[PDB]
């Protein structure tokens, strides 16, 4: 349709006829709105006029007309009839108009899929998601999500390699898209963001998908959304342990302060006071800070799957343990002193790796894990090894039933675990001694420590029995 050309006139004189045809069909369905297609069995007169009319339509060989009718069906929303044509003519017509409009591309893709041509649909959807057409972020998320699905299934005549490469590009773009969508939503809803800025954020984020650098620098880092920063380091395969840990430290501290604030507001309601202007009260005890913090760690863990570089257990577990000590998230407030260990075990950290780290914590005596607070470190080790023992015992029972002989990867216990418990007993003996000669009077934790000793000895016994042959005889009857 080159402008300035003089066939336009010829096209316009046909468009006036085609429009009038629309009115006829429109008035037809209108006149016969509520009329049944069959009465007493055979067809009515209102039905026959519908067939006679639509006959004339499908009996035409005017091509500009049939194009105008495809466009018209699309307009009125009749996916009913258009997807049921059969003809390629309509496919070929769509193949030209696809890279141009979202609605048309969706029709094309629908045609492909019903013909088991999933890969071709995934290609159209992906390109559309990367394009500069006016498409919203959420629609780009839907397009990518569909492409991902369609590229993950076999399409005949296309190599596995070509499928996987597309499925992979869609998966990466979908991950980034979801991040961008989380940002945009949070920023717009953020009470501490000026309206003037929000409109600006909506303009640059509710469109084509942006790079991970931009999302980090211009948005996630500026607004201190550290959880999203971490997801971004994951999606970018960001190799930088120090920055990752700095972000973990900021996330923990930010969450702690927020939980503290919410518990304060609550305490004011239960005392009669008034909350700051524009502060929605809490009608129910909010969670203690260590509970909200660990909630944050879980949400991220499930989103990244522990196999990431944003979960270096050797650095992250000591930091969380550090937090617990330095912020009195312990028995004084009614929390389980082993909560940090429980958290990472349920999360699915392998028992061997846990004990391995805890050993390092105990040997190096760093940051807060010093003096008599190593009492706490010993308790964590006791709890970790205890769970490990229980695991080995159940895996033994497990393999006696469903019979066979195996055990790969999983670290297996060595004498080092036994030695570790020996040293742990020494540390306790040392802490108890130092506690008995403190200035001001003996320490109050005498029996508390005597108990821990018994537990540790019990565990060394068990571990010694397993190590000593009771582990190779677990699938045997006693």
């Amino acid at each position: 349709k080159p402008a300035n050309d003089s066939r336009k006139k010829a096209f316009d004189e046909r468009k006036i006829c085609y429009n009038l045809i629309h009115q006829v069909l429109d008035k037809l369905e209108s006149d016969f709105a509520g009329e049944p297609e069959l009465v007493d069995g055979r067809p009515t007169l209102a039905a026959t006029k519908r067939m006679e009319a639509y006959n004339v339509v499908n009996d035409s060989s005017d091509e500009v007309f049939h194009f105008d009718m495809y466009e018209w069906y699309i307009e009125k929303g009749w996916t009913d009839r258009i997807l049921s044509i059969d003809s390629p003519h309509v496919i070929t017509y769509l193949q030209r108009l696809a890279e141009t409009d979202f609605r048309h591309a969706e029709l094309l893709c629908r045609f492909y899929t019903t013909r088991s041509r999933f890969f071709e649909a995934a290609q159209v959807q992906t390109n559309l998601a990367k394009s500069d057409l006016n498409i919203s972020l959420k629609d780009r998320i839907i397009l990518l999500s569909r492409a991902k699905g369609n590229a993950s299934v076999n399409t005949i005549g296309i190599s596995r390699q070509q499928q996987q490469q597309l499925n992979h590009e869609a998966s990466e773009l979908l991950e980034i898209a979801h991040i961008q969508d989380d940002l945009l939503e949070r920023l717009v809803a953020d009470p501490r963001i000026p309206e003037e800025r929000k409109a600006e954020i909506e303009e640059f984020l509710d469109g084509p998908i942006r790079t991970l650098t931009d999302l980090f620098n211009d948005y996630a880092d500026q607004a201190n959304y550290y959880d999203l920063c971490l997801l971004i380091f994951h999606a970018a395969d960001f190799h930088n342990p120090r920055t990752i840990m700095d972000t973990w430290n900021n996330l923990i501290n930010q969450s702690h302060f927020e939980a503290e604030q919410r518990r304060e507001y609550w305490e004011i309601v239960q005392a009669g006071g008034d909350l700051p202007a524009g502060v929605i009260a809490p009608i129910a005890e909010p969670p203690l800070p260590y509970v909200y913090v660990s909630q944050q760690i879980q949400l991220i863990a499930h989103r990244t799957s522990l196999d990431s570089l944003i979960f270096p257990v050797n650095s992250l577990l000591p930091v969380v343990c550090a937090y617990a000590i330095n912020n009195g998230q312990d028995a004084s407030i009614g929390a389980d002193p082993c909560w940090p260990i429980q958290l990472f075990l349920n999360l699915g950290v392998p028992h061997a790796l846990m004990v391995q780290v805890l050993e390092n914590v105990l040997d190096t005596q760093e940051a807060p894990f010093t003096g008599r607070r190593r009492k706490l470190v010993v308790q964590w080790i006791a709890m970790a090894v205890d769970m490990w023992v229980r695991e080995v015992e159940r895996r033994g029972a497990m393999a006696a039933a469903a019979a066979s002989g195996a055990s790969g990867s999983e670290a297996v216990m060595g004498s080092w675990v036994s030695e570790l418990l020996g040293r742990a007993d020494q540390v306790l003996t040392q802490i108890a001694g130092t506690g008995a000669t403190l200035r001001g009077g003996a320490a109050s934790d005498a029996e508390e420590i005597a108990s821990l000793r018994r537990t540790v000895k019990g565990l060394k016994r068990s571990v010694d029995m397993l190590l000593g042959g009771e582990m190779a005889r677990m699938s045997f009857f006693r």
Binding site: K1, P2, N4, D5, A199, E203, F204, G207
Partner: protein, 106 residues
Amino acid sequence: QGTWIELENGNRTIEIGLTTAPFAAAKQPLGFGNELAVQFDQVPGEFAVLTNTGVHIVRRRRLVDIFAKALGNCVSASDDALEREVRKFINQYGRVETIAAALAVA
């Protein structure tokens, strides 16, 4: 030459800034504004329009961009359809500038 660019409902323009290097076809007023001379020495000017919803990129179009686009609409037309479009260019830019644009597009 003027045009109206419509922004969607809710778009409040905040600021507009140049993203490319400042335009200059010469070092003194005579010759300074000669867009035609620099069509192939520096990219067309682009401008970032900041709104409360995003940043829109607006690009200046050169004669060769207009000439190529216009000819792209003449691909499906007559021998006289091109001559008509070409005469528009000659009446505005003169014959030499128009034929030079055709050579460039070619």
